[PDB]
Symmetry: T
Subunit: 144 residues, 12 copies
């Protein structure tokens, strides 16, 4: 894809993930409650920021960002969670799965943005990669 | 409807509105840019909070909150905006329209919650009513 | 009862609960220690505030608040905990039991204060109800 | 009266009281000086806020707030203080008298706003009632 | 006039202006709303401070400050605004008119205080002159 | 007594004193109201902290802290106040009496903890002694 | 005197007054204790600053500031207080007496500095005059 | 050019732009005044920082930064503005023109620094590019 | 000269000095580095503020401030420094020389502004004089 | 040993423990991850401070602190951990073991410093003892 | 001496030292100016606190603190500095001399307070000893 | 080497340097004391952070970080300092030597990480390079 197309897909995943971790946030069960309730909030706050940055990068690039939830679920590569009750372990396995998926997408973003000579989208991609890789480590350590 | 059903519809509108004012936030054109770009951010921050409060009130009430964007666009009473370029005036007319709609919904919430004896949902509804009514005044003054 | 009588009973429970969660605070055992030690502190800080608000509302109402620990254990509906060692689970079951009891009492407070036309005691009662209901949800989610 | 008429009278009293406690603020005499000089400042800061809230509630309600000092002294139920020297005791007796008067007015506001179905003016009235009742207690305790 | 007489007239204008910019604050109409609503608040906050400083300078000088709204409208040189709806432009023209008037008064204050050897009233007058002159520039630039 | 026995008695007095100064806090009468209402709050906040520190020192020492209000009134050396109305002077005489009593107890604590080689309980005791002695001076100066 | 000579005398009074209000600070007796203990601290903090500013102005002026307590008691016009116990009233009468004395000295400073063309010492003098005159008013109101 | 030569030219433009936006800052006319007066201040604060960073990067690189205004106007590629009165629109068109020019220069900087293996100058260039591109978008949206 | 002409010359010196101390800031050599690097930054921050205040005072006065670096080097009385390496001592001698020059200019400003009756420019001049005289003392002490 | 010799051994253990809890910090596995990752950071921050305080106390005492990692592993009484993966339980058992060891060492420090008349090293030792004893309690409660 | 007599002598030295380091503060000459000017300020701020603590400890002990500068120079063991110009080195040698003297006095204080059983004066003495010993090290390192 | 091998060597140098600058921190002698004592603290705080970041990057990369001081001195390229007394100049020469060494290592890290496609390790390396190059400049300027 072109850089802006990768950006729009990533933007779609951000809003879908924002909704998804809210689900984990509200419906966690178990003696783990306080910690995951607290952690998921920080996570969706981050997706809200990513959602906004991706969209603004797209307009700076001269293109159209997704502007409706309808376009978003049409472009996501993230499956929506319909369940309404979870335990810590399952929540972290899913978040880990989605994080690994985002990491691949940001690597593509970084690679194709570089070929186009898009210096600033590349550094944006590399910064998100850094955050994702640190969290993936922590998620994996937690599940070990 | 029952209190929790009104809450779920309101929750649906919150996430749809969150997306909608982001659109206004990114695509404003005109010498008004900085102000509306700044204002819309405060507004969607508020919808993000409302979205979370509504959902948690629903689980406290023993019911299921919407957990997917798909359920959300199925329950909204808010029309999604597909346009990608706006001028201050049109943005504020739409926001005003949606605010007036939310005010009616929160009045129903307050009324039916009261009949059920749901004291805390009533005060929540009345607090949102207060914020909505102050903003509606400001929106109308702006368009005068 | 009359509003001030409900207030005095609630005041009695506040100081008894203040002592009770201190017990949980000092005597928790288990890998859960840090979290419950931290949580119980926030909880008894809250009871200390409730204890003071209830008492001052009573004097504003023209009556006498409980002024001795002796009157307090004579008026409580809360059983004192004599054990000196606990595990997370048992602590949260007890706190949940006591919270549910307080919720019923604050509902009575709200109801009878309303019949007397006591507008401000009603809003006080409804605010405490809101906090109690949110915590009851979290306590229950934790024990699930 | 209608809700907005009660609001305008209350608005009139707020600006008149704002001026009145400034008088006490500047002209206190006695070893009590620092405390009452400090207390009266907090009090008129509060009236300035009340003055603004009442007025904005009136415009939100679709009516006209008082916009001149002339209309204000025409609508007050508060007598203006012409003396320019006071001692702690007399200052607190007057403030107490005026507070008791405001409490009756806010009770009417709450009652008539409720009959009209004005949910948000009712909660505003009840919140002011709470503050007034706490201060009335303290004023009375001080004069005992 | 004598220094204290100029001070009392200025004190009268301060409370009248405090009321006047509140009117502009509540009744602005137009796409300018947020800015002037915000600006007028800062302005009346300033008049509230000026009102208090003038009055306290008068008592320090051994005289009586105005203590009633009635004395105030009897001493002002500022005309009260009876209209209840305005647009940015008209609001700023009026504020500018009143600021220019205050500047002349503070120049007289500074001049006559100096002849009396009143060192501290002179520096107070000169400081207000500085603030007034900066705002007059900004008001004029705005209307250009 | 043994160090932990002195600690438990002190813990008992802390909760009893916490209740006692709340009484003074709510029921002060007189032109002194604001100051003593404010001072008593700081004092019971301190007893709440002392109550918690004493108890935790006891568990660190391998013993059982008091965990019920019932055990507390069985171990106190502090008489509970049944009156519900006081004037500044009487409040400070009582607080002074109780402070002098606590000072003797902390001196014993310091002395016997030292004989046992309990270095940290000794420094805790000496720190409380410092605070008590400064307050006793201020209380006495106030009553002079 | 010459400006620097007035400055040195003022510097002498500052350190003597710093010591004097410490005496009032430590030895106040009476139900007024907390307030005057608190007020005197703010006052000597101010004298410490004045002491430093006066001295640095003298070196900026090319002269020698007092550098010993011995030179200070040789140059003061302030009588040292040998008593070690006071009541609020006597403390404020003395402070008032000394403040009135400082005001005369700062007026001379302002006058002679002006004749010499010393612009910055004049504004320093006038600023201190402002603070002194406000406090003198408050001291006098307190003693009325 | 060599990296340090591009850096010196950029440094020259920074100080020239610092002066230029001050002009816009002082001489804006129109109902837009407050906003552009505020915005231009943030902009020249940024140029002051850029000016300092560029210069220090040059010395770190072992070369000489421009040290006089004379060398600066000899090296700029930015035309100085001699007019002394402007309206919002013209100010933003000029700033936009200059920003687009800076963006091209920072792209060259990034490109040539990379060929030389200058890792840190490249990241500096890319960070400035990011800020410039976001502002260019906002400037363009404003002028649309 | 007329007040505004003195102001424009001072404005010219401010921007030239801003550039000059940046030179000292970047090119200091010696074990003194950290201190002078830190000090020079505070100094040019001050000149940036002075530059802005002078210019705005000129427009408030109804005249034109310098708006180009070209006009600035045409009006300065300050010689630009072309050297690119310095040691602490030489830097402070130059800064001292320039400060003494600014002091003379601000004295003229104060004197001629006074003759014109320009009260606020006089206090501005006297405030800068105060800062300059304190720094001149410190600079001289440093070089002694 | 002599006081300074005990101090050097303690200093050696501090840097070794600093490294050891970093290991636990990076290599924790399990659903406990976030908590122990967070806790271990606070712990090694503390050892870094202890390391610095011990060393500076030694130089104040006129002796040489350890200045190389080589001297440190030669003087420690703490065994280094070579494993690179742990679970909460094992981490806390080790930390507990090392804390108990440090407590014995600080008791010796306190005892021998006292015999030498080293007042300040004694209070330092007693303060560390206090922190260690509180943590040992919490560690033990956690493992129960 | 008795504890209170040692305290009074120490109190005398505190005010004399407060004056002495002010002298160093104002009259330092040399490229060291900024650092010692800054350091001496922190030092006399400390003596001001020590002066107040010593005095209040004396009244808590039931004795009379020095209340005049005259009593102070009669009790000091510190020689007053009459010179008005110094260089870094001489300032630090003197401060070091006086610090070593204070250390001996605080050791006596600690020793005799202990024999009297004065627990809190002992900890006060030991805390000052700690601060003095750290500064003595730094002073000596500086002079090496 | 492979990226993780370079990371482990860098991690080894970080802990060795952390110890080394502590030595400079404790043992500086000379009138430079305060500045270098303060500077070295900021430096070792930085190495502590670098030590932690390097180690966590290694685990994120799927490898083992150094977990013992023993492995560290086996892998460093940094020579340990055995001396216990230094003067400013020697301290800065050593730090400069070590910084230049770290810069070469981070350049290798950046280069080899890039060949492996390790985007985030590259940006980490480039950021450290930026900090190192700025400090190297300052160190060199200081020694000039
Ligand atoms: Fe945004
Ligand atoms: Fe939430
Ligand atoms: Fe209270
Ligand atoms: Fe308002
Ligand atoms: Fe006031
Ligand atoms: Fe605790
Ligand atoms: Fe100073
Ligand atoms: Fe810089
Ligand atoms: Fe400006
Ligand atoms: Fe240190
Ligand atoms: Fe004190
Ligand atoms: Fe870490």
């Amino acid at each position: 894809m072109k850089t802006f197309e990768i950006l729009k897909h990533l933007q779609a995943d951000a809003i879908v993930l924002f909704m998804k971790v809210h689900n984990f946030h509200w419906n966690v069960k178990g003696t783990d409650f306080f910690n995951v309730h607290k952690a998921t909030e920080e996570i969706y706050e981050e997706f809200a920021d990513m959602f906004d940055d991706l969209a603004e990068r797209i307009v700076q690039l001269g293109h159209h960002p997704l502007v409706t939830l309808s376009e978003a679920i049409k472009l996501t590569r993230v499956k929506e969670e319909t369940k309404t009750s979870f335990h810590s372990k399952d929540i972290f396995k899913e978040i880990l799965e989605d994080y690994k998926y985002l990491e691949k997408e940001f690597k593509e973003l970084s690679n194709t943005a570089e070929k186009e000579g898009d210096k600033v989208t590349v550094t944006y991609a590399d910064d998100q990669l850094a955050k994702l890789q640190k969290s993936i480590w922590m998620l994996q350590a937690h599940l070990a």
